[PDB]
Every structure is written in C-alpha cells, then in structure tokens.
C-alpha cells in the first residue's frame, strides 16, 4: 500500500510542516486529503503524473505540494494556522492506466498544531484489578486501564496477555476525555477494558500488561524546561493473577 | 459535491437491516464507490459499481448502481457489531476523475444483551490501594450514560466488548475521580 | 466497420526517432484538437465557438504508457524497425482560382509511414515561409498517416508554386507542381 | 534512412443511429501491425498478433482493467457524442458551386458535412452519359470539395445545368451555363 511519513506530528502555532507520501508503484494519480476530526476527506490537490490536475481547493496562502519526478509527493504548510489540526491523507490510483480510478489510502499524518510546545506532556497509565464481587457473581474478571494527563491526543492503547496482543474481550474508548473541557490545550484522559474468565484471572502465570504508545516531540524540537522532554515513548502498567 | 449521502448518525441492533441512502447527480456515466473507515484506521474501499446495473458486493454489503433513480444505496441483511464504522459514498467527478467524498454516515451497531446483569463495581489500583475506579457493566443497549454534573468528575461513554471464545458481548462504562461509586454513575438511567 | 459517424477519441502516437509523439482527437476524419506535448498545451482546431476544455496532462501520461509499451515491444520483436512507405503527393486549390482573389493552395501527402516528414512550399523555385500551415498527422485505416499543408497565395500570372515533401521512403525530394489556371 | 520504431493507440468510437448502436474498438499497434484489440462487442481483449498475445493475456487477467474498458463505450464514446451533438454535428456550411470548362466541370467547394449528391442536366433532361465524377476531397479544414465533369457534345446545345443537394440547403442549388 501507500507509505506516509510521519504518522504523528506536533508543531507550534506559527511554524512549518512537511508531509511525505510514496504511492503504490506505477500509480499515476495521487491525492492529498484533509480530514478534520469527525468529518470526511476534503480534497486538497490531485496529481496526474508530475503535473497538477486539480488544486481548486488548495489554500495557496500556506498550503503547497509537489510531485517533481511523478512518484513520491510532499505537502507543506507554512506558516501554520491553529485550524490546520487534522489528519492529512495521501492516496494513489492507477487513474485508468493499469486499473480503476479507485484510490488506495495511506495511514495519514495526524497533525496537532498547538499554542505552545509547553502544553505537551506524556500520559500516566495505571491498570486496575477486577473486583472480588464480579468474580463470584459473574464468573468473569474485568481489568481497566486508564491513561491520564496527556497532550495532545496522540495515543495508541493496546492490551497484552503473556506477551501476546489480545483483541478478544478488549474495548477502548473511541474518543478521550478532556481533563478540563474549557481549556483548548487541555490534557486528555482515556479508558479501556479487558475482560477474562474467572479461571484465567486466577492464574499467577497470566501477565496482564497495558501499553499506551505516545507520540510526542521530535529530535530537533528545542526543550529547556526541567520536566523531561516529552519524546515519543511507551508508558505501561501491569497486573498479575491472584486468588 | 455531486454525491449526497444519508446525513446523520445511524444506530442499529446486532441483527438489524442496514440501509444507507446515496444519490448522485453528475451528467455522463460515472463510477460509484463506497469507502469504509473503521474506528482508528484508514479508508478502505468497500465496494464499487463501474457502470449501469452493476452491483458491488463485499462483506455482506450490497449496492446496486441504479440509473432510473440516480441512486447507489448500501444494504446489508444482517448487520454486525463489528460493522460499526463510518461509511463514505464516493464518485469521481470532473475531466480528471477526482475522487470526491460525501459527508459520510456514522454507524454504531449495539449488541443484543440477552440477559442483563447491571452492576456498578469498584476496581482499585494494582500499584497503590487508595485510588480506585467505578465500572458499570452488563447493562442493556437501551441504557445510556451522560457526563456527570460535577466539573471535576469524569465519566467515559459506553463501549462494547465481545469475548468471542464464549459468544458473549457486554457494555461497559468507567467513572473515576467527595463522591463514591454508589452515586458516581447517577444522573443517568442507572436501572 | 460501417457506422454513421466514426470518431478517434485518442489517436495516440509515439516513435523512437525524435523521440517524439502526437496526441489528437478526430471526428469523422477531421482534427478536433491536438496537444503540444513539449509546451504542455492543448490547441483546438474546431471551426466553431466552444467553451470546451481538455487537460493536456492526459496526453502526457497516455503517451508515457505508449513509450513504456514500445520499448518492451521493440525488444520482443528482435528489433523490428518500421518499413518506410512511399508518400503520395497531390496539390490543389481550396477554391476556384480568380485573378487577385486570395486563395489557399493545399498539398496532401498521403500514405505516410513512419510519421516523419518535411513539407515546404516553393514560389518561383524559391522558398516561402509566410502564410504556410499544416495539420497534424491524421490517422488512416491501414495505420499509416496523411498530412495536409496549406499555402495562402494571391493568384497572379507570374507566381508559380511547388510543394516539396521529403520522406525516407522517397530517396529524392519530391516536388509536385501547380499553376493558376484562371 | 535512420531506424524508427513507432507505436500507436487508437480509441475509436463507432456511432449508428444517434447513440443506439455504439461500438468501441481500442487498437494497440506496434508499427503498422495491430497487436491487441479491445472490441466492445467482444467484451474482453483479443490478441491479433503474436506480439499482442502476452499483452492481451495480461490485461484480461486484471479485473479492474476489464471493467473500465467495458464501460468506456459509455464513459468515452457516448459522453463525447453528447458534446459532439452540440458542436460539429450542428456545423452546416453551404457549398459554393461554379461551372467552367477545361469537358464541362462543376466545382462544388467548401461544404460540410460530406453527404452530397450532384446531378447534371443537358436541356432539362438529366444527362447521364459520360459524367465522370471525382472522389470526395477532404480539405482537412472541416470542409469538403468535389468536381464533376461531363462529356459534352455542345453543338446546337442550349443550356447545361449543374444541380447540387446538401443537408445545409433548404432548397437545392441550380447554376446553369448557356
């Protein structure tokens, strides 16, 4: 499929960003879309091979793209406007040369344009053990993972039993909660559930681990404040079986 | 633009019949698409019809390109909880066939909770033992939760987990934060 | 094939000589428009008024696929080159000739292959560049081409015109003659 | 003569009775040799030449290509014919017809479209003996011209007449020669 880079990016309010994309080999057409929060992909630009075909919806004040050799592309935004916080998708299509007009999408680049890089902090994550009530009531055990105090919403939460990633019985929240809703750069909080039978939780060999992958600041981002530089990292919380 | 979708969210039960309207306007003979975006993923192509009376089918979804009514409605006989996603109707327009997307239609499929067992448990930290979390489980799909009135009290929105090994699905919500578990989840239905 | 109207919505041409290429649209044997591949520009030839539009990028990428397929087919044929045909030249006026009434001399070069040829007009044995124009390579059913050159001339009793075409199938620059029989 | 390797591609549309019977034939040509052909009445690619066999066998395996070509007769041919119906098919220019000997010639020039029938009259009775006619000459500028000669025995003849009919002419043109 199409390769995009980076996956997440944090940039200051009045600053520049560049999104890279490599289409499926041999695809003529290449698009850049903008998907803001819960919305649909707003088309920005369409390339033929190396030539622009449509750019009616491209705000030339800061947005600009290029596909010089007609293969990979690069979209740039400078300066940034706090309204630019969205997911920037890249897609490619044969355009009728070798296949159909259907577009194949990449992972996109989540851009969160912040007011100041000083409101960017990683999450703290804790896992809470099941209650003695439901293990005798429902013959089931529910674990809860809670990531709090992170900004921005660049997290990927996953459950891990005995080193193997589990999806059965798992359930994370679709959207996080703001610590203080009125704040526009508010830290977030996110919850998740992992359910297992009573017999499984009552095995001291079963290791329950909740990983939340945070994506933060880059290498070259300047950071002076005493609080540790919030680089992209993994914060975890674990629990064991007991009887 | 040139493709109008079923505006508004849709919520259905675990075996209901899904129908998402989509109409097109453009002159000529365009292709019609359906893209799906599962929560936390990119856009996939679901199905497509390239010309007249062609019917695209995938994952149990069907859509017939109907010229007589300029329509392309998406249908699925027995929807599933895993089908909860956002569905985009798309048709390429212009001389260059640029793929332009409609607004999209959010679809959440709630499970059918056979025998509810509503409860509000207190789960306490595995590292410490003086910070805990209230958990609401096994309630009906008709039951709904709301954000607490107190500004400094957090409640998640419900979510559906399915333990496939035992063919069991249940709803769940989390409250944490002087209050206690017994009155934390109130200001809602709390059956 | 029999039909009321036959169109060639994409006569795509690419040859290794230049290397050069050509992209035109034909309807009922006449040229609607061509695309200047070097200037990336669509040039219309319709004898009407129209607000029509055609993105020249389609030609550039279509011809690119032709180049891709050509190279692979030159290889799969043990290098089989194009055989040069002998062009058939015919000169005639567009309208009946009247002394002093501006007219147009037409030089039709038919059965052109490969699509590479110089067509110039001579007046009294000397070259003329003012008032000369030509069409693109128009397609033929046997996959050859024909070109038509135009010379705007003022009929007189002292001006003599020749059409000079040059093709590798000729081995001798052909000159077709025309005199203004009033 | 320097070596030259050509390659041609022709997406040809055939229209009969408006858009009732429409047929697309996309011809891929190596030099002057059509190697692969997509005939819209066939439904899939068919190699015409050994060179086109690997190309046809490959394109036929790709489902996405097949669906595009099966729909090109509508997306390309019928679509373009709709704007052809508003431009070139509206073009009607009247022929300019003159009479002069060299044998009596009737010079019918600068007319569109191509369908044209012209007749020779002698004294009112249609002279049909020795009326050699020329092919339809395509000027290449969206006009046609045709010449019609007649073996005339003029002695004691009175008034030869050229009579032409054209889709641009409500009433046909008649020009005489006494």
């Amino acid at each position: 499929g199409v390769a995009q880079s980076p996956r997440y990016k944090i940039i200051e309010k009045r600053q520049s960003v560049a999104f890279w994309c490599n289409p499926i080999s041999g695809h003529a057409t290449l698009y850049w879309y903008q998907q803001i929060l819960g919305q649909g992909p707003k088309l920005l630009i369409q390339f033929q091979n190396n030539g622009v075909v449509d750019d009616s919806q491209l705000p030339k004040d800061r947005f600009s793209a290029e596909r010089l050799k007609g293969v990979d592309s690069t979209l740039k935004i400078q300066p940034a406007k706090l309204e630019d916080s969205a997911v920037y998708l890249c897609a490619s299509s044969s355009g009728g040369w070798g296949g159909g007009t259907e577009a194949f999408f990449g992972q996109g680049t989540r851009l969160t344009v912040v007011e100041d890089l000083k409101n960017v902090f990683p999450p703290e994550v804790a896992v809470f053990e099941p209650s003695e009530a439901e293990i005798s009531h429902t013959q089931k055990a529910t674990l809860v993972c809670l990531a709090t105090g992170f900004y921005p919403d660049h997290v990927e939460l996953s459950w891990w039993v005995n080193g193997k990633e589990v999806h059965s019985g798992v359930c994370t929240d679709p959207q996080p909660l703001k610590e203080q809703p009125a704040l526009n750069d508010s830290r977030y909080a996110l919850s998740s559930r992992l359910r297992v039978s009573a017999t499984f939780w009552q095995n001291p060999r079963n290791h329950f681990r909740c990983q939340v992958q945070f994506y933060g600041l880059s290498e070259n981002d300047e950071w002076t404040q005493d609080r540790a530089k919030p680089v992209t990292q993994i914060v975890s919380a674990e629990a064991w079986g007991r009887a | 633009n040139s493709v109008t979708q079923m505006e508004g969210p849709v919520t259905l039960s675990e075996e209901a019949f899904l129908t998402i309207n989509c109409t097109y306007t453009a002159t000529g003979y365009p292709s019609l698409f359906w893209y799906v975006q599962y929560p936390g993923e990119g856009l996939q192509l679901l199905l497509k019809a390239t010309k007249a009376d062609d019917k695209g089918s995938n994952k149990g979804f069907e859509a017939t390109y109907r010229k007589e009514t300029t329509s392309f409605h998406l249908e699925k006989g027995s929807v599933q909880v895993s089908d909860s996603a956002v569905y985009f109707c798309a048709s390429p327009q212009g001389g260059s066939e640029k793929l332009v997307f409609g607004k999209g239609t959010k679809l959440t499929v709630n499970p059918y909770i056979q025998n509810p067992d509503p409860a509000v448990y207190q789960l306490r930290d595995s590292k410490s033992s003086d910070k805990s979390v209230c958990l609401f489980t096994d309630f009906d799909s008709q039951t709904n939760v709301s954000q607490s009135k107190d500004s400094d009290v957090y409640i998640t929105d419900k979510c559906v987990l399915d333990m496939r090994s035992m063919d069991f699905k249940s709803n769940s919500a989390v409250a944490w934060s002087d209050f206690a578990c017994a009155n934390a989840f109130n200001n809602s239905i709390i059956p | 094939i029999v039909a009321d109207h036959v169109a060639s919505y994409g006569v795509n041409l690419y040859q290794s000589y230049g290397p050069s290429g050509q992209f035109t649209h034909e309807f009922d044997g006449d040229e609607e428009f061509y695309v200047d591949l070097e200037r990336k520009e669509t040039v219309w030839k319709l004898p009407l008024f129209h607000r029509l539009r055609f993105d020249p990028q389609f030609a550039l990428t279509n011809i690119a696929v032709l180049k891709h397929n050509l190279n692979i087919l030159i290889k799969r044929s043990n290098s089989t080159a194009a055989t040069n045909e002998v062009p058939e030249v015919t000169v005639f006026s567009k309208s009946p000739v009247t002394l002093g009434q501006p007219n147009t001399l037409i030089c039709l070069v038919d059965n052109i292959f490969p699509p590479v040829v110089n067509i110039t007009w001579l007046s009294n044995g000397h070259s003329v560049t003012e008032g000369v124009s030509e069409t693109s390579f128009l397609s033929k059913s046997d996959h050859s081409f024909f070109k038509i050159s135009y010379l705007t001339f003022l009929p007189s009793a002292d001006e003599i015109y020749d059409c000079k075409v040059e093709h590798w199938g000729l081995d001798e620059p052909l000159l077709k003659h025309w005199e203004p029989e009033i | 003569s320097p070596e030259d390797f050509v390659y041609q591609f022709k997406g040809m549309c055939y229209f009969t009775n408006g858009t009732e019977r429409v047929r697309l034939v996309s011809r891929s040509i190596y030099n002057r040799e059509e190697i692969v052909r997509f005939d819209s009445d066939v439904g899939e690619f068919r190699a015409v030449t050994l060179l086109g066999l690997p190309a046809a066998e490959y394109w036929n395996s790709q489902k996405d290509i097949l669906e595009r070509k099966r729909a090109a007769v509508d997306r390309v041919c019928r679509h373009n014919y709709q704007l052809e119906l508003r431009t070139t098919l509206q073009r009607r220019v009247e022929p300019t017809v003159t009479i002069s000997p060299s044998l009596l010639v009737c010079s019918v020039t600068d007319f569109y479209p191509a369908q044209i029938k012209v007749r020779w009259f002698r004294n009112g009775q249609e002279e049909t003996a020795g009326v050699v006619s020329t092919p339809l000459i395509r000027n290449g500028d969206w006009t046609f011209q045709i010449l019609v000669m007649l073996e005339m025995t003029p002695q004691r003849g009175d008034v030869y007449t050229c009579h032409v009919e054209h889709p641009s002419l409500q009433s046909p043109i008649t020009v005489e020669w006494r």
């Binding site: - | 212009g94 | 919505y9 055609f54 | 997406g11 690997p54 490959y58």
Partner: peptide, 12 residues
Amino acid sequence: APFSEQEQPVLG
C-alpha cells in the same frame, strides 16, 4: 470535457 481512451501498460 471530452474524455479520451487510456492505453494500458504491459508487463516489463
């Protein structure tokens, strides 16, 4: 706008 037919790429 006038649409035009597209030539397909062969396998290298």
